[PDB]
Amino acid sequence: STGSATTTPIDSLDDAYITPVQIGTPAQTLNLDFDTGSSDLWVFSSETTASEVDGQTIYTPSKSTTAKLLSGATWSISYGDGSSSSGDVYTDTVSVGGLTVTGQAVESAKKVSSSFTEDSTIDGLLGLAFSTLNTVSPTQQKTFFDNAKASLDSPVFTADLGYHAPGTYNFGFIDTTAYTGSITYTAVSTKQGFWEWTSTGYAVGSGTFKSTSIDGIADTGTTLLYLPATVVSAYWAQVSGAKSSSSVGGYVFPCSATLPSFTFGVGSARIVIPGDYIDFGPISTGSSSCFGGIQSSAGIGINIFGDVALKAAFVVFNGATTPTLGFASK
Prior knowledge:
Layout: E1 3-9, E2 17-23, E3 28-35, E4 41-43, E5 68-78, E6 84-96, E7 99-112, H1 114-118, E8 124-127, H2 144-148, E9 156-160, E10 167-171, E11 184-187, E12 196-204, E13 210-218, E14 225-227, H3 229-236, E15 243-245, E16 250-254, E17 262-266, E18 269-273, E19 279-282, E20 289-292, E21 294-296, E22 303-305, H4 307-310, E23 314-318, E24 324-328
Parallel strand pairs: 3-8, 4-7, 13-22, 14-21
Antiparallel strand pairs: 1-2, 1-10, 2-3, 2-6, 4-8, 5-6, 6-7, 9-10, 9-23, 11-24, 12-13, 12-17, 14-22, 15-16, 16-20, 17-18, 19-20, 23-24
Protein name: Endothiapepsin
Domain Peptidase A1: 17-328
GO biological process, one term: proteolysis
């Protein structure tokens, strides 16, 4: 089997991407944030505290003939950005782009933090990291990909995120028309439950490539590119007037700037992030200070290849017995 679904930016900045997902019988379609940095599929629901719902589409398990309470199971998750959610669990039928999993754990939120409430466009998350990070207790549950894997034509999914445009998540096949040149594969460590890999270095603009190992995670659920302070300083030093602002919470730059590109290494291959991808616009409405898309990972504890980086590539998440990651230009 295979699946193919379009993923769409939630706003003009590509802050996140939503993908329609069919849950239950008859289908209830919710728009979920596919997140390769977590491993829970959770949704706004009929059980979500009413004051914490503001415009989201909810899953109502009582209206699904295939829903079953997973008795005694609870979940609770906290994300890197400080947001959180928790609740109980149903199993139900879940389909993505024509690919169907029966008995998928669908984690129903009883509580969500303010950032989720305030984002009316995201109806929940669909985790695509390794199932070892799944938070369901006392019986840990599998991700949608883990459940689908044995039925897939090939045990892979791909992320093809657009810059200010829709893109695609495919399951079970590699679309050879969706990228240019060849795909370069690189080793993955699953020790922390993430799609963790080591980039071979970077360049700023037309500058020389610096060969240096940068361990980090491929994370579709993180907006920005978070790298070591040395690398980030080297990038922003090439933008006149750019500075790190503790008051704003990272590097800002004059909105009048033309940003240089940023290249990262994948083995001997190179992925080029155009300068425009690194512009996240005014810090507040009408400001001439703009927020940077490359930020320091210092104090996160891990480097994160988020959407800013991933959307410059066609990315293969290879879930074979020994997982790997592939990157191609597009």
